[PDB]
Amino acid sequence: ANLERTFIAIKPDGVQRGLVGEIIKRFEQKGFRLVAMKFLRASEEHLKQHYIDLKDRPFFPGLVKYMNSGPVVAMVWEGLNVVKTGRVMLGETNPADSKPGTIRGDFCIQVGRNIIHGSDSVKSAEKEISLWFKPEELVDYKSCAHDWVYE
Amino acid sequence: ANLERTFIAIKPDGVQRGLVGEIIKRFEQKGFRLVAMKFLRASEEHLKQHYIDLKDRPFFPGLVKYMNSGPVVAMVWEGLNVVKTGRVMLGETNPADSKPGTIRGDFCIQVGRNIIHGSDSVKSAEKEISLWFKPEELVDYKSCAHDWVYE
Amino acid sequence: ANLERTFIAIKPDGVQRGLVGEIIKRFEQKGFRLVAMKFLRASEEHLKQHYIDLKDRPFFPGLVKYMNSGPVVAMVWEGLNVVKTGRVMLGETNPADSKPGTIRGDFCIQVGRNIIHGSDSVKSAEKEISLWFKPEELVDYKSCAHDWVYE
Amino acid sequence: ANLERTFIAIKPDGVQRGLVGEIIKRFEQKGFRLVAMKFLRASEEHLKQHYIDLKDRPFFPGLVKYMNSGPVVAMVWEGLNVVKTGRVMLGETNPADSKPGTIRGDFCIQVGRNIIHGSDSVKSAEKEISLWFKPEELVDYKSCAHDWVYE
Amino acid sequence: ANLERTFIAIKPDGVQRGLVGEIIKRFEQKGFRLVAMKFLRASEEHLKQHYIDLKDRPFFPGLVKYMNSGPVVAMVWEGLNVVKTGRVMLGETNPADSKPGTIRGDFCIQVGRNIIHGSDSVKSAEKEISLWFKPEELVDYKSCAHDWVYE
Amino acid sequence: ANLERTFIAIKPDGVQRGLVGEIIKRFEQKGFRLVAMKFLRASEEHLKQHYIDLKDRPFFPGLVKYMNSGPVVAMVWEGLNVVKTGRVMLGETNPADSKPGTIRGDFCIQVGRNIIHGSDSVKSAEKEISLWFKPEELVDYKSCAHDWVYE
Ligand SMILES: Nc1nc2c(ncn2[C@@H]2O[C@H](COP(=O)(O)OP(=O)(O)O)[C@@H](O)[C@H]2O)c(=O)[nH]1
Ligand SMILES: Nc1nc2c(ncn2[C@@H]2O[C@H](COP(=O)(O)OP(=O)(O)O)[C@@H](O)[C@H]2O)c(=O)[nH]1
Ligand SMILES: Nc1nc2c(ncn2[C@@H]2O[C@H](COP(=O)(O)OP(=O)(O)O)[C@@H](O)[C@H]2O)c(=O)[nH]1
Ligand SMILES: Nc1nc2c(ncn2[C@@H]2O[C@H](COP(=O)(O)OP(=O)(O)O)[C@@H](O)[C@H]2O)c(=O)[nH]1
Ligand SMILES: Nc1nc2c(ncn2[C@@H]2O[C@H](COP(=O)(O)OP(=O)(O)O)[C@@H](O)[C@H]2O)c(=O)[nH]1
Ligand SMILES: Nc1nc2c(ncn2[C@@H]2O[C@H](COP(=O)(O)OP(=O)(O)O)[C@@H](O)[C@H]2O)c(=O)[nH]1
Ligand SMILES: [Mg+2]
Ligand SMILES: [Mg+2]
Ligand SMILES: [Mg+2]
Ligand SMILES: [Mg+2]
Ligand SMILES: [Mg+2]
Ligand SMILES: [Mg+2]
């Protein structure tokens, strides 16, 4: 089979607060497969295109500036319902609405500093994956745990 | 009802994915007393009795064969509302509906590989404990912390 | 706003069960600022004042005795909505109603041994802070991570 | 290969202090395979035979009484060098001499309450295994990560 | 029959880097009893007294300045061999020589930002406890675990 | 020497055994700055250049094959003595001799599956960094904690 994929980015605040390993561990222990990963400071234009649907929102200027203010960890993760499940794992957009046990619930306070991004839909994921990674950067392998994670 | 007991089994996938100590720690940390524990490859006939209520469901033979495909860790835990609270701790039957912070929410993806079993009621717990353990295998002792966990 | 403060106390059961660091870590990693902290055996009088609204409840004598039965860690934490959010982190009054991922959800079982206290409102918080701490015991400094937690 | 085995027991203090899960995780994460596990109060005669080479030592009486004073978690673990590297993981007999990051180094203080036992040699391991388990209690299965742990 | 005690302070970098809980957890897990604790910005004078033995060394002014640059967590811990064992837990003065598994080994790089202080000797412990704490701030109580930590 | 760099790669066994987050956290927690990171299946030729000094060793062919058998996580880390300190953090080449608390000591068993690589010297580090990364992939930014990790 060819499993669902989602795009996950650890925002500059996640990197600056030293939560990269912690956040990656949460995806690994869940049983999702890391497909791609790189580390870069995305240009304001890259970030504008990432968040193109939000361009007319008033917080958008500060969002783009915050997102370009340090490096990000960009990832692709694979598995059954990984898009929706990735989102549940993150918590709500606002850390204030995010439950203890979620990444945002556990680790942050304010919507403007909410440490992580996950694709909100499959069609979003595929667009975001194409924008952040070259095809060659997506690694096709099989997880040793697969048959212990899936029927 | 401080002497309530429940049956908890770590399924073959739980054992194979190295989650035994992680699971046990969650019960220990909560204040529940470990009463019995053993490690075995349960026979197909034993598993058919365990899941006798499901013998007509289409997933039954698959479920049995998987349950026999590796060892399980069988346990008896005791404490106030341990049956219901144990259930909460595991999360929903389907990992897709299990909240972050729960065992299945944190660690698995698919209902057919859902890493753990807990009794669904006192009556089920009593049946399961009888099925899985000899009476001499239930250990009598007082937990150190009891007077700090209970009034 | 961001200068809100709350009073958090680790109850004698939380100290005795070795949960002081685990509790503190949860507040630190969330991004809240530790403002004040001390360790003491609170007098029965001090405890009666802390719980003055409950003076006529049936459980109040047992409550005051339990709370005097060992030392307590008293703390003040700062941040946006720290009162409300602190409560979310603790769980519900009754650990039976507290979800996995919260302090009571993870660690305790019975309402009379529920390991921790948090102020239920800003007015409660300011009363409790005045009750437990001398003004000089409240330390003003800026958190390293502040600008990565707050826009 | 017919891989080496060792006998590990978590002593009554390890059980009472809630360290069973933690300990088991350290063995699991190292890549050792759990072969056998049970939970029991070992009789004084069982304990005398286990520690027979110490019978004339002055601490022997107290050792047997303490080891009988609560249940123990009895285990057999498999792996290349598991006896010697198991000992290294435990620390030195005296926790005072055990380094941080070892089990006794992290968790205990006094030689008479040193939380765990491990076989000191291959010959001791085989003797101890034979005395603590029935042959049928030793579960034969292959670890899913075997080929990632071994050449 | 007072057990041995030591003075441990979490330095300003320790607090700023959000390691207070982690650090305390290590001492609780080991079996030491928390006797005293408070949180304060130590004055230059207090710190010159604390480090008076170093007053003529080149790094002393820099040390005293750094130690005043943020609040510190000051603690008294009790147990068998706590002064020496405490030291071993911290690591060497220079993090470069501190082993993985020690506090400085896990968390620090440079000698002037080495996150924690522990007394060097019983005589120094006694002096430091007296310098930092009033007698009434030392809490006399018996630990839950004592009989499982000590024979 | 604060700008010293080393090359760390999580080997395919580390990726498959779900240790990526765990490993990254240890580097983060220590205070080193992540400079560059990517995830790829390294070609046999690329790996032959990486290990060119071992090309005549009997294990060389199998080493290259194993290192190509799954993706690796390639990283550049910066900090004072990061090459030597990084080596200490990994353990010894042989897991069998690696101390508990080190990455290999904690997580692996056999030299042929030793989960991680780190440069052995500054000269080796510069050669490996150049081999594995494009100049533009070394990210320029300041770590928020720098002034709390360094004088
Ligand atoms: N400062 C600020 N940022 C916001 C606000 N709403 C959304 N954002 C940021 O914009 C990101 C994208 O918004 P959105 O797609 O609606 O939410 P998401 O998919 O859950 O991340 C969020 O993750 C926040 O980082 C806001 O009101 N203020
Ligand atoms: N393959 C498969 N297994 C299922 C399904 N539903 C339940 N199971 C398995 O059967 C076990 C028992 O089912 P059930 O008693 O209803 O759920 P539980 O009490 O929450 O464990 C579950 O824990 C699953 O492992 C399904 O639709 N497909
Ligand atoms: N024993 C007992 N203690 C209670 C009961 N209800 C509340 N308490 C205790 O009294 C404390 C204060 O009560 P309350 O303010 O209503 O709950 P809280 O603000 O969530 O802590 C609780 O945290 C419990 O420790 C009860 O029914 N029985
Ligand atoms: N109370 C007490 N117990 C001891 C002493 N020496 C050893 N023991 C206990 O006896 C056990 C077995 O001793 P030994 O075979 O020499 O050490 P081990 O193989 O490292 O456990 C130790 O693990 C301790 O639990 C002592 O001096 N006093
Ligand atoms: N900046 C700087 N600080 C130092 C140096 N040597 C020691 N210190 C600091 O001064 C503290 C006290 O030194 P000392 O009492 O000898 O070592 P300790 O008992 O390990 O803490 C150390 O823990 C360091 O924080 C140095 O060479 N430079
Ligand atoms: N299969 C196998 N692999 C080995 C052996 N010795 C070394 N290796 C592998 O080759 C790598 C490089 O060896 P070396 O450069 O000498 O040590 P390193 O710098 O500590 O990794 C090791 O990290 C192992 O992955 C061996 O005897 N057998
Ligand atoms: Mg969106
Ligand atoms: Mg059922
Ligand atoms: Mg109240
Ligand atoms: Mg012996
Ligand atoms: Mg000194
Ligand atoms: Mg080499």
Side-chain angles (χ1 to χ4, degrees):
Chain A
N2 171 22
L3 270 159
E4 184 168 295
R5 289 164 175 183
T6 197
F7 177 73
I8 307 289
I10 303 171
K11 301 181 174 171
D13 50 323
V15 173
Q16 287 284 16
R17 295 176 63 213
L19 292 161
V20 179
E22 179 56 61
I23 289 175
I24 295 172
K25 177 158 181 179
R26 293 196 183 198
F27 281 83
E28 289 184 287
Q29 69 187 14
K30 184 56 168 175
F32 296 129
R33 178 176 77 81
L34 184 69
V35 175
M37 174 163 73
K38 60 192 188 185
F39 177 72
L40 72 162
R41 179 198 228 101
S43 71
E44 284 191 17
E45 187 59 18
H46 186 123
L47 295 166
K48 273 182 242 105
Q49 301 302 116
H50 181 74
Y51 286 125
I52 194 74
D53 66 309
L54 304 176
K55 70 197 188 196
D56 296 322
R57 316 305 321 285
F59 58 76
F60 181 78
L63 165 63
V64 171
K65 284 306 187 199
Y66 144 68
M67 287 290 293
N68 174 254
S69 74
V72 113
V73 181
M75 290 160 291
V76 178
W77 291 90
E78 177 205 69
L80 183 59
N81 285 113
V82 66
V83 170
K84 158 102 205 320
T85 295
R87 301 230 111 199
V88 165
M89 288 175 70
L90 304 188
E92 299 300 326
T93 307
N94 190 346
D97 308 337
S98 299
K99 308 294 200 162
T102 65
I103 291 156
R104 295 185 183 124
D106 286 345
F107 299 124
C108 50
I109 293 173
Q110 184 131 92
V111 66
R113 299 286 187 275
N114 73 350
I115 75 181
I116 189 158
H117 166 86
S119 303
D120 76 352
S121 73
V122 161
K123 201 173 151 285
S124 279
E126 293 302 321
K127 170 195 151 270
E128 290 165 12
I129 294 165
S130 292
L131 165 76
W132 287 83
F133 294 93
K134 310 168 192 161
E136 53 264 46
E137 296 177 321
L138 316 183
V139 181
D140 182 357
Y141 64 108
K142 180 187 148 157
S143 305
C144 69
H146 184 87
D147 298 340
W148 295 105
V149 185
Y150 295 103
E151 291 196 294
Chain B
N2 295 170
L3 292 188
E4 197 170 289
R5 306 104 56 92
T6 197
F7 178 73
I8 301 299
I10 301 177
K11 305 186 167 159
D13 44 324
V15 176
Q16 284 281 9
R17 291 179 64 219
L19 295 165
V20 176
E22 175 63 35
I23 288 159
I24 293 175
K25 174 179 170 174
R26 288 192 190 202
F27 280 87
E28 292 181 284
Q29 285 185 139
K30 182 68 169 167
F32 297 132
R33 179 174 73 91
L34 182 60
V35 180
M37 179 165 68
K38 63 205 219 178
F39 181 71
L40 73 171
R41 183 191 265 99
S43 73
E44 286 186 89
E45 317 94 79
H46 191 77
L47 294 158
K48 291 170 170 184
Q49 286 299 113
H50 180 77
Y51 285 126
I52 197 58
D53 293 353
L54 304 173
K55 87 173 214 304
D56 299 325
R57 300 274 262 290
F59 61 81
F60 183 76
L63 172 55
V64 171
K65 308 325 136 165
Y66 138 73
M67 285 291 295
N68 182 249
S69 74
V72 294
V73 181
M75 296 160 285
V76 183
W77 293 88
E78 170 203 86
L80 177 67
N81 280 113
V82 68
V83 167
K84 193 50 254 291
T85 294
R87 279 248 137 171
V88 175
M89 290 170 60
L90 314 181
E92 300 299 334
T93 307
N94 176 24
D97 306 327
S98 309
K99 296 299 188 212
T102 70
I103 293 157
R104 296 176 178 131
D106 289 342
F107 301 130
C108 59
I109 289 161
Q110 214 183 55
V111 66
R113 298 291 187 274
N114 74 351
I115 62 175
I116 190 162
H117 165 89
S119 319
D120 67 6
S121 59
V122 172
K123 172 177 216 178
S124 286
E126 291 306 308
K127 181 167 144 236
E128 285 166 22
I129 292 167
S130 303
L131 176 56
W132 285 83
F133 291 94
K134 296 163 190 77
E136 67 261 41
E137 290 175 328
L138 291 237
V139 184
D140 298 316
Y141 73 108
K142 175 170 205 184
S143 306
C144 172
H146 177 85
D147 293 342
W148 295 112
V149 176
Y150 296 99
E151 295 188 287
Chain C
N2 298 172
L3 296 193
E4 190 169 300
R5 333 172 298 174
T6 197
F7 173 71
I8 304 303
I10 300 162
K11 300 184 183 174
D13 52 321
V15 181
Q16 288 280 15
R17 297 178 63 212
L19 292 164
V20 183
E22 170 65 23
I23 292 173
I24 291 161
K25 177 178 149 159
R26 289 187 182 210
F27 282 81
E28 290 177 292
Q29 83 192 359
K30 180 70 167 171
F32 290 129
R33 188 172 69 86
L34 180 69
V35 177
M37 187 164 65
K38 62 195 183 181
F39 179 75
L40 71 159
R41 175 187 276 103
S43 68
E44 281 177 292
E45 179 56 24
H46 198 69
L47 288 172
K48 186 194 298 54
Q49 294 308 115
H50 180 81
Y51 284 128
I52 201 67
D53 61 302
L54 300 177
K55 74 174 74 159
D56 298 302
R57 307 303 293 282
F59 59 74
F60 182 85
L63 172 47
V64 172
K65 282 259 181 215
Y66 147 63
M67 286 290 294
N68 168 258
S69 66
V72 120
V73 184
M75 296 165 285
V76 179
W77 293 86
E78 184 203 68
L80 181 60
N81 293 136
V82 70
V83 174
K84 204 270 173 35
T85 289
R87 292 221 126 202
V88 171
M89 292 168 73
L90 307 191
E92 300 299 342
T93 300
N94 178 15
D97 300 332
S98 294
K99 288 301 172 178
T102 69
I103 292 160
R104 295 180 178 130
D106 289 337
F107 297 124
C108 61
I109 298 186
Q110 212 190 50
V111 63
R113 294 291 190 277
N114 70 352
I115 64 179
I116 194 162
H117 168 85
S119 307
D120 67 354
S121 69
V122 169
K123 268 161 46 282
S124 288
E126 292 304 318
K127 183 197 188 272
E128 286 162 16
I129 291 172
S130 292
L131 173 60
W132 288 80
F133 287 101
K134 313 170 173 71
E136 54 265 42
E137 294 179 319
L138 305 186
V139 192
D140 187 23
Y141 65 106
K142 195 202 175 155
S143 305
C144 165
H146 179 88
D147 289 344
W148 292 112
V149 180
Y150 295 98
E151 61 186 341
Chain D
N2 184 340
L3 287 182
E4 193 174 292
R5 306 96 61 84
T6 196
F7 175 69
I8 311 290
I10 304 169
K11 290 176 176 177
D13 49 317
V15 178
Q16 289 279 17
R17 290 179 61 212
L19 300 166
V20 176
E22 176 58 46
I23 290 171
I24 287 170
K25 183 194 168 185
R26 290 187 185 207
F27 283 84
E28 282 185 295
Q29 69 190 10
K30 180 63 164 177
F32 295 139
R33 181 175 67 91
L34 182 57
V35 181
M37 182 166 63
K38 63 186 175 183
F39 185 58
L40 78 169
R41 183 191 260 84
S43 73
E44 298 198 10
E45 180 65 19
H46 190 161
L47 293 168
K48 283 176 227 303
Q49 295 303 140
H50 180 71
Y51 288 127
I52 194 63
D53 71 288
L54 313 175
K55 66 180 250 194
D56 299 308
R57 311 283 293 285
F59 60 82
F60 181 81
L63 172 56
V64 166
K65 293 300 193 178
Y66 141 70
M67 289 289 295
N68 185 245
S69 76
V72 116
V73 184
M75 296 163 287
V76 178
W77 290 91
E78 183 191 67
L80 183 63
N81 310 139
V82 62
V83 174
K84 84 177 189 176
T85 68
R87 290 285 285 195
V88 172
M89 197 178 328
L90 307 189
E92 301 294 328
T93 310
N94 196 329
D97 303 318
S98 306
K99 300 310 192 332
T102 67
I103 288 161
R104 296 174 181 133
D106 292 343
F107 302 124
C108 69
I109 296 166
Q110 203 194 66
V111 61
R113 293 291 182 277
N114 66 355
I115 72 173
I116 193 158
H117 166 89
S119 311
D120 72 352
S121 68
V122 171
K123 189 175 159 311
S124 294
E126 296 288 344
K127 182 200 179 276
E128 290 174 5
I129 291 169
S130 292
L131 287 167
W132 285 81
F133 291 87
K134 311 186 189 352
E136 59 261 47
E137 283 169 332
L138 313 184
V139 187
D140 193 341
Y141 65 108
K142 188 135 221 234
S143 309
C144 61
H146 185 86
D147 286 337
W148 293 114
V149 177
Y150 295 98
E151 189 187 329
Chain E
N2 334 330
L3 280 184
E4 188 174 300
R5 307 223 268 236
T6 201
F7 177 72
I8 304 296
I10 302 172
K11 292 171 176 182
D13 51 319
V15 174
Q16 285 289 11
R17 293 180 60 211
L19 296 168
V20 175
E22 172 64 26
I23 289 171
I24 294 168
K25 185 197 172 149
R26 292 191 185 210
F27 282 82
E28 293 175 284
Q29 283 185 149
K30 179 62 161 174
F32 297 135
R33 177 177 77 84
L34 186 58
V35 173
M37 182 165 63
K38 58 197 182 166
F39 180 69
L40 73 166
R41 176 192 276 109
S43 69
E44 274 218 6
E45 263 304 295
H46 195 55
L47 295 166
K48 289 166 161 184
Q49 284 23 105
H50 176 77
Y51 288 124
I52 185 153
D53 79 290
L54 299 172
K55 67 173 209 301
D56 289 322
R57 305 293 301 282
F59 57 86
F60 176 84
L63 170 62
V64 173
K65 187 156 216 296
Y66 140 76
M67 289 286 292
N68 178 259
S69 68
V72 105
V73 186
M75 290 165 290
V76 179
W77 293 88
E78 165 197 273
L80 188 64
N81 309 136
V82 64
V83 171
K84 179 55 171 186
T85 294
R87 270 283 167 132
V88 169
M89 299 179 77
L90 308 194
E92 305 289 337
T93 304
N94 193 342
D97 299 315
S98 291
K99 302 306 172 165
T102 66
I103 296 168
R104 296 175 176 145
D106 290 341
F107 299 127
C108 299
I109 292 171
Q110 212 184 43
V111 60
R113 299 283 191 275
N114 72 354
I115 68 174
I116 191 163
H117 163 95
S119 314
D120 76 356
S121 64
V122 171
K123 177 228 66 174
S124 286
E126 287 303 301
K127 186 194 182 270
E128 289 167 10
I129 292 163
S130 295
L131 174 65
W132 290 82
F133 287 98
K134 303 136 155 189
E136 62 255 30
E137 295 177 317
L138 315 184
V139 186
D140 187 337
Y141 70 102
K142 278 296 310 300
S143 300
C144 175
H146 182 89
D147 286 350
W148 299 106
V149 180
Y150 298 96
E151 72 192 345
Chain F
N2 297 169
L3 269 58
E4 179 170 297
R5 309 99 58 92
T6 200
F7 176 72
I8 303 301
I10 306 168
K11 293 172 174 180
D13 52 323
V15 168
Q16 291 275 14
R17 289 178 64 218
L19 290 181
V20 174
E22 177 60 39
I23 294 162
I24 291 175
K25 185 188 88 170
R26 288 179 181 216
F27 280 85
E28 283 183 292
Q29 287 180 143
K30 180 72 160 168
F32 295 124
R33 178 172 79 85
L34 184 60
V35 187
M37 183 165 63
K38 71 182 135 181
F39 181 77
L40 72 163
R41 183 188 265 90
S43 67
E44 282 211 332
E45 282 308 299
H46 191 66
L47 295 162
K48 289 181 199 201
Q49 293 310 115
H50 180 81
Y51 284 127
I52 190 170
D53 71 293
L54 300 176
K55 72 191 323 141
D56 296 336
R57 302 296 290 284
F59 60 77
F60 181 76
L63 170 60
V64 176
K65 187 226 180 263
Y66 143 70
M67 284 288 294
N68 170 256
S69 71
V72 295
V73 180
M75 292 166 286
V76 180
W77 289 91
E78 175 197 75
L80 179 68
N81 281 111
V82 65
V83 172
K84 164 108 154 204
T85 295
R87 294 282 290 196
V88 171
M89 291 170 65
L90 299 198
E92 304 293 329
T93 306
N94 192 355
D97 302 338
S98 303
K99 296 313 195 154
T102 71
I103 288 168
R104 290 178 183 138
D106 294 334
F107 298 127
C108 64
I109 295 175
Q110 207 190 36
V111 66
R113 297 287 185 277
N114 76 350
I115 74 174
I116 194 157
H117 168 89
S119 317
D120 72 286
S121 68
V122 167
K123 169 175 167 213
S124 288
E126 291 306 312
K127 179 207 139 256
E128 294 164 13
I129 289 162
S130 300
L131 177 61
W132 287 80
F133 286 97
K134 297 176 206 149
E136 57 262 51
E137 293 175 325
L138 282 288
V139 187
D140 306 312
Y141 72 109
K142 177 170 159 181
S143 301
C144 151
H146 186 85
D147 285 357
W148 294 108
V149 173
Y150 292 87
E151 309 154 47

